[PDB]
Design a protein around this ligand. Structure first.
Ligand SMILES: [Mn+2]
Length: 56
């Protein structure tokens, strides 16, 4: 029940590791949104250029 020096150190590192893991997870999540957004933009931009080619 008492909290030992070794436990405090181990808990403190694990805290840091989880926070680093969340940073990693948040980046993968944001890059995933960034890629799907860019893929739809590129599609729409390609479509827009097809349309304008046919209007020329
Ligand atoms: Mn999170």
């Amino acid at each position: 029940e008492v909290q030992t020096l070794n436990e405090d150190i181990f808990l403190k590192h694990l805290r840091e590791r989880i926070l680093v893991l969340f940073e990693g997870l948040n980046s993968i999540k944001k890059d995933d949104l960034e890629n799907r957004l860019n893929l739809t933009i590129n599609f729409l931009e390609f479509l827009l250029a097809n349309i304008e080619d046919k209007l020329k």
